[PDB]
Design a protein around this ligand. Sequence first.
Ligand SMILES: Nc1ncnc2c1ncn2[C@@H]1O[C@H](COP(=O)(O)OP(=O)(O)OP(=O)(O)O)[C@@H](O)[C@H]1O
Lengths: 618, 886
Amino acid sequence: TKNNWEVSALSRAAQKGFNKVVLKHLKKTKNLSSNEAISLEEIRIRVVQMLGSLGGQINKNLLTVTSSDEMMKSYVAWDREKRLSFAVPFREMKPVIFLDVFLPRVTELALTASDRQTKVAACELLHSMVMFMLGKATQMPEGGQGAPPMYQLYKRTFPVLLRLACDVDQVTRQLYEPLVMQLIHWFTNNKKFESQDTVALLEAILDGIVDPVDSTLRDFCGRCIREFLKWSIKQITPQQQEKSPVNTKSLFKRLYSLALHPNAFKRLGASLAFNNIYREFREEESLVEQFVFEALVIYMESLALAHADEKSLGTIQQCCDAIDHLCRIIEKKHVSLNKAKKRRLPRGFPPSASLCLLDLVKWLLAHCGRPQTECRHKSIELFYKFVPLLPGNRSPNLWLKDVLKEEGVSFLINTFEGGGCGQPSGILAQPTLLYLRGPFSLQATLCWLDLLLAALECYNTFIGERTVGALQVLGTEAQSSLLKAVAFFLESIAMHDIIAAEKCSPQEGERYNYSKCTVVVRIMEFTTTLLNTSPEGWKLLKKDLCNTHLMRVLVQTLCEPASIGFNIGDVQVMAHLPDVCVNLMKALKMSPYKDILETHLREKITAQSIEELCAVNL
Amino acid sequence: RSCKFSMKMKMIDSARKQNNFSLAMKLLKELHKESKTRDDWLVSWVQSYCRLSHCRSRSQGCSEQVLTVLKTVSLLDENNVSSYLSKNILAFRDQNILLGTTYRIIANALSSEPACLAEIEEDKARRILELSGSSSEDSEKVIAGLYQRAFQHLSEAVQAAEEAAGVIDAYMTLADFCDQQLRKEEENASVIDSAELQAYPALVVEKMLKALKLNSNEARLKFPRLLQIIERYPEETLSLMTKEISSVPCWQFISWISHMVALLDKDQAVAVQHSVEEITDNYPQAIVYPFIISSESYSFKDTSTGHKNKEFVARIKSKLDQGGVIQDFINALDQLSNPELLFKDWSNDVRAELAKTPVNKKNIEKMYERMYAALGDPKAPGLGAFRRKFIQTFGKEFDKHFGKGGSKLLRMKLSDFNDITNMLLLKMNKDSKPPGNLKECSPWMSDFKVEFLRNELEIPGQYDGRGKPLPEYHVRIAGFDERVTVMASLRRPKRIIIRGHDEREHPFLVKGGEDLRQDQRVEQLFQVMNGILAQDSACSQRALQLRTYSVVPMTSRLGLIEWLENTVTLKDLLLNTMSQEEKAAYLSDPRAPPCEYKDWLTKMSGKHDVGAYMLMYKGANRTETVTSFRKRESKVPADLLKRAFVRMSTSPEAFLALRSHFASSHALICISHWILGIGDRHLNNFMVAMETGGVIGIDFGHAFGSATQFLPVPELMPFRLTRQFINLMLPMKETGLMYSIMVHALRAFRSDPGLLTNTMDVFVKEPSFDWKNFEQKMLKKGGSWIQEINVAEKNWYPRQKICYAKRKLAGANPAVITCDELLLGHEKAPAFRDYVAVARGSKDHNIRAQEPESGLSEETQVKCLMDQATDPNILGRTWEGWEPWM
Ligand SMILES: Nc1ncnc2c1ncn2[C@@H]1O[C@H](COP(=O)(O)OP(=O)(O)OP(=O)(O)O)[C@@H](O)[C@H]1O
C-alpha cells in the first residue's frame, strides 16, 4: 500500500520553483479538510496500541494456548502419513510436494486475514485443495490402500468450510456456499453413505449448530442439516435407510439428546435444527407418526428447561417456534393421529402399547400448572387447540365436564395448584409462604411467586375461556388454597415487600420486583375475569380477594406504580398497566364493591391534591 | 514522587517472586532513604525487606540462613506503631505474620544443627539469647522460647486476620506451624514437651477446617492429617472436629470419600457421619460404589457406642441403592468374567484356607455359598448364553466330585483336594471360548433400556471433587454396545462400551478377579502428587502433571477402568515404527534378543525354567553379564522413538516440543513410580498419548514394593530407563532434561514430606485383599525382621510399607531400600547374597555404592537412582517379559 506522490498538479507546479502557485495548490489540496474514514492501517496501529495499553498481564491472552493440553495438541500433524501428494510438472522432473503442510496455514489465512487480496487468494487455494482432496480420495487401485483414507483431513477441513460458507465477504460466500451443498450431495450419495467421512461431515454440522459465538454459523448449519436430510432420503434406496449410522432415526435421537441438554446453546441448536427440518419431517408419513409425540414431549421439556436461562440467548423464541411447528403437523394429520398405534414412547410417560392423541391431551392437561412460564402457556394453548379435533369433536366445556365428573373435582384443583406433574409441589402444599425450610433464600421466593403465578394463570384461563364455571372450583367443595395464597400475597408481599419485608444485593431486587409485579398484574386480570364471567358468585371473593388490600394495591398501581416496584424502563408493562387498571376499575362498577373503590380513590385523588400540585410553580 | 515509589516497590516484588534477590536488594537499597519520609512507605519498605530476606534464606544453609534473617528482627519491634499499625489492620496482620515467620526460621535453623549458635558471632549469639527471653541455657530453652515467640506472633496474626484470600494464608501458616510442632515430638520421649504442645491440635483442626470452608485447595490436601490427628488426640479434638466439619460445604470431601466410608466403622466415626449422610443426600452417585466395597468388612465391636454406627451404616444403605439398579449393574458386570478364572481364584483361596490349622467349617461355608451361588445353582439372579453352557457341562462334576459342600468336602485332604481340583481344571482349561456379542454374555446390558420408569445410572468415574459438582452435566448410561473384545494377557479383562445419553461411546475396561482398591489409592496418591507439584514454583513453570485415569472398584473381583482413547502402548509404538525386516528379525531370529536371552540363560544355568534365573545369579560374574547385555542390546534398531516422533510431528519446532514433553513426562512418572515403589514396568504398561506425545503409566498391580518381594525373579530396577529412552535424547544424554525434571519433582515431593505419607492411612485402615494375602504369605516364612518388628501390634504390614515410603522420601540410598526389600521377601533363597551384591553395586563402577546409607541429598539421590536403573549388571539379569534391551 505504498502510495507516494504521483503526477499531481502540486509536483509539476513545484518543479519550476517555490512560488505562489504552489501556495495556491497547498491551500487547495492540503486544506480540503472535509473528512476521511478510518483505514485498515490505522486500525492495525490502534490494535498494537490497545495490546500495549492493556498491560503485560492482560496482554498475553492473544496467545491463548496457556493450557498445556492445548499446547501439545497443536504440535501433531493433522494425519501421521502424508496424503495429497502432488507431482509438480516441470518438463523433465516432476518432483513431489505434499499439500498437507499448507492446509493449516491456508485455512487460518482464509478465515482471518483482514487483507482482501490475501484472503481471496487463500480461499481460492483452499477450494482447489479440497477438490484435490476429493479427487485423490477416489483413486483407481482399491479402497483400502490405493485410495488413501483421508478421514483425518476431512475431520479438520469440514469446520473451516462451514465457517467460510457463512463468511461476511461476498466473494468467499459465493465461493463456499455452493461447495458445502455440493459436498453434502456427494457425501449422501449411494457410493459414500456408509463411510466414516459422512459421519465426520454430519458431526461437523452438528458441532456447527451448537457454536456459542457465531449466530450466522448456526443459521447456516441448520440449512446444512436440512440439505443432508433432503439429499439423504432421496439419492439412496429406502430399505438401506435403517441400516446406516446417520439415518433419520439416529439423527432425531441425537437431536433429542441436544434438546434436553443442560447447556443452553445445545438446546438452541436442536431447536434451530427442527425449525429447519420440519418440512421434510412433515412430508414423510412412516416417520412422522411414530415420532411426532416423542418430539413434542422432548421440545416441551426443552422449553421448560429454557426458563432458568439468561434472556438474551433466545432459547425460548426458537423452542416455541419448534413446538408450534409440531403442533401444526399434528393438526394436518389429526384424523390418523387419534388412532391407537404403537408409537415411539415419549419419555416420562407410564408405559403403554397404544398411543393416541387422547393421553397426550391428558398429558398437556396434567402439565398446565407447571412453574415454568412459557412452557405452561404453550401447554395450555396446545390443550385448547387439541380438544375440538378428537372423537366426537366436543368443546372443552363438555370434555372437561365429563373428565371432571368421572374423576372427581379435586383432580382439576390438583392439576392447577399442584405445581407440575413430576413433583407434589405447588401452592397446595404452600398456600402462604411462612415455611420454605431454610433461611429464606431468594431462589426459593421466586419459586413460590412463580408457583402462585402458575396456579393463577391456570384458574384465570380456565374460568375466562368458559370451559369451567368459576363457582364450582372456587367454592369449598374440594379445598383449594388459591384464594389463601392471593390473600397472603396482597396482605404482606404485594405492596412494599421488596427484599426488606420478604425476609420475614441491590441487583437481586430487580429480579424479585419483576416476578412480584407480574403476579400483581395477573391477580388484577384474574379479578376482572371473576367479576365479568360470573355475575352471580362475587360472594366468594370477599374475605380474601376484593378487600382493602386489593384496593390499596390498585390505587397504588394507578397513581404511583414505581412504589410497588414496576420499572419505567420497561415499556410493554407500563403500556399494559392502563388496560388492566381500566378493566379492573370498569369491572368494579357493576359490583357492590363500587363504594369501597370510590372511597379508596377519594382518599388518594382529591381536589385538594390538584390545588396543592398547581399551587407550586410548574 | 509517590508514583515513582509505588512503581519501584512493585518491581521489587516481581524481582523477589522471580528469585532475583541480587537485583531486588539493590532496588530496595536505593529506596531506604525515601521510605522514611512517610510512615506508609516505611512499613511497606520494611515488609518488602523482611519478605525478601525470607525468600533469600532458603538456599543458604545454617549459619548463613540465621544471619540473613537476624537483621530483620532489629527493625520490626521498632516504631511505626504510632497511629499507623493501629489504623491499618492488614499492615498489622502482615507485620505479625512476617515476624512469626522470622522467629520460625531462626528456631528451625537452630534445630537441625544446634552447634551453630555461638559458631557465628558473640554479639549476634547474645542477640539470639536475649530475643528468646529464656536465659542461661545452651540449647534447651532458647529454641522453645523462639518457638513460643513465633506461635505468639502467628496467633496475633490470626486474631488480626479474622476481620477471602487474605485470611486463608494466616490460617494455613498457623495451622502448618502447629502441625509441624505436633509432628516434631513423635520421635522424642517427653511429657513436658507434650504438655506444652497439647494446646495445639484444636488450633490445627479448627483453623484448617475454617480455611477449608473458604474454598482452599491447600486445606483440602491436608484432610487426612485431620482424620489422623483424632487417633492421636481424641478427647480434645473429636467434638470440635465434629462441629467444625458441619459448616464446611457439601462437596469438599468427595475426593476423600474413600477415607470416610472406610473410617465409618472405627471408634472415630462420629465426626464424619454428617458429611457422609449429606453426601448421600445430595449426590447419591458418588458414595455408592465406595459404600458397596467398604460394607464387606466392618466388625462393629459391640459397645455402648457401636450400635449407633451399625444403625448409621444401615440407614446409609437404606438411603442408597433405591431400587437395586446399581446392584443389578454390579451383578450384570459380574457375568462377563470367564468362570474358569473364578474357579482358579476359588481353588487358591480354599487352599489358603485349608493350609492353616485348626481349619473349621465356621468359615468354609462362607466360601462354598458364593461359589455355589455363582458356579453352582442354575436358577441364578441372572446369567446368559455363556454361563448356562458352562454350568450344564460342569456343575454335575461338582455335586459328586465334592458333593453338597459342607457335608462332604470338610476332610483335610490337601493332597487329595488338589488332585481332584487339578483333574477338573485340566478339562476346564480346554472348553472356554472367547465370548462374542453381548446377547450371549449378559442379557441385561444388551437390553438395558433406560426407561424402566426413571432409574438413572451415571457412568462411573466422575465427581473429581475439586468444585461444586453440578450433577446435571454428568453423562448417564443410556444403553450398551454389542461388542466386547477379550484381551489375553495371562488374565482376561473385557473392553466394553457404555453408550451415554449424549449419543457418544465411552469405553471402559471391566476386569474381574482382583481387588481394585489398590489401583484407586495409587491414583489418589497421583492426584495428591500433581496437586503438590502445582503449588511448587519450579514445577509450575514447567507444568509438570501426572496423567491419571478414573478407577472405580465396585466390589471385590469386579472393577471398572476408564479406557483412554487415541493412545497406544509403548510396545505398539515401538513395533509399528519398525520396518518389515526389523520386526521380522526381532520376532523371529535365533540371534534376536528375545531368543538369545533364553539361550544365554541356559548356557549360564543349564535349566529351561524360572530356575534358570536363580542359577545364573550366583553363577555369573559382572563381565560375562555386562558384555552379553551390550551385545544383546546392540541388536535392536537404535532410534525407534526418534523415528516415531519425526513421523508424527510437523516441523523441527514440533519435534523438539514433542520430544521435550515425552522426556519430561516420563521423567516425572519415573520418580513418581519410585516414591511409591511400583514394579512390572514393561512396555505394555506404558501408554503414550498420540495427540500430545505425553506418557501415561498404567497397571499399578505391584503398587508398593512387591515385585522384589513376591516374585520368583526379583525386579531390581527402580523404574524404566532402557536404551530406547536414552537414545531419544541424543546427541545429549540422560543427565540433562530427564535428570533435571527428576530433581525438581523429587525436591517438591521432599519439600513437604507429610502429604503423601498422610494420604496412605487408608492402606492400613482398610487394607485390601491382596495386602492381607501378602501379609499371610509374609507371615508364613519368617526371617531376620521377626526379632525386630512386632507382629501382634497391628495390621503392621501397610505400616511397614509407609515406613519404607517415608524413609526413601526422607533421603535414602535406593540401593539400600532395594536390598532391604530383598531381605524382607527373599530370605533363604540360594542366591540372596548375589541378589544384594547385584542390587547394591560394585563400589568402583557405580555411584550408588560410594554413598551413605541415608541422610542423602536431593541431587545425589537421583544421581545414584539413575545409576541403578540403567546398569548392565542389573539389566542383564531381569525377567524376559520385561524386555530390558528395548
Ligand atoms: N487405563 C487404561 N486405558 C486404556 N487402556 C488400558 C488401560 N488399562 C489397561 N488398558 C489396556 O488393557 C490391557 C491390559 O491392561 P492392564 O495391564 O491394566 O491389565 P492386566 O494386563 O491384567 O495387568 P498386568 O499388566 O499386571 O497383567 C493393555 O494391553 C492396555 O492396552
